From Swiss-Prot, chain B:
Official protein name in the record: Spike protein S2'
Species the sequence originates in: Severe acute respiratory syndrome coronavirus 2 (2019-nCoV)
Gene it is expressed from: S
Function description: Subunit of the fusion protein that is processed upon entry into the host cell. Mediates fusion of the virion and cellular membranes by functioning as a class I viral fusion protein. Contains a viral fusion peptide that is unmasked after S2 cleavage. This cleavage can occur at the cell membrane by host TMPRSS2 or during endocytosis by host CSTL. In either case, this triggers an extensive and irreversible conformational change that leads to fusion of the viral envelope with the cellular cytoplasmic membrane, releasing viral genomic RNA into the host cell cytoplasm.
Length: 29, 21
């Protein structure tokens, strides 16, 4: 839950993710 | 669904809240 503008970046609703990109397709997780 | 909408419109430091999966 941190809008990491004060610290590959993708922003989820659970926070921001660093180190992982975003993929259009979906698979069982 | 309309019943789902009617149900939805009836229920209202250091302590974070994790979002559901
Ligand atoms: C993070 O901050 C920017 C600018 O303050 C805002 O536009 C953006 O919506 C914020 N992120 C989220 C997930 O709300």
């Amino acid at each position: 839950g941190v809008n990491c503008t004060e610290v590959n970046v993708f922003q989820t609703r659970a926070g921001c993710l660093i180190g992982a990109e975003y993929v259009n397709n979906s698979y069982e997780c | 669904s309309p019943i789902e909408d009617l149900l939805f419109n009836k229920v209202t430091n250091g302590l974070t809240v994790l979002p559901p999966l």
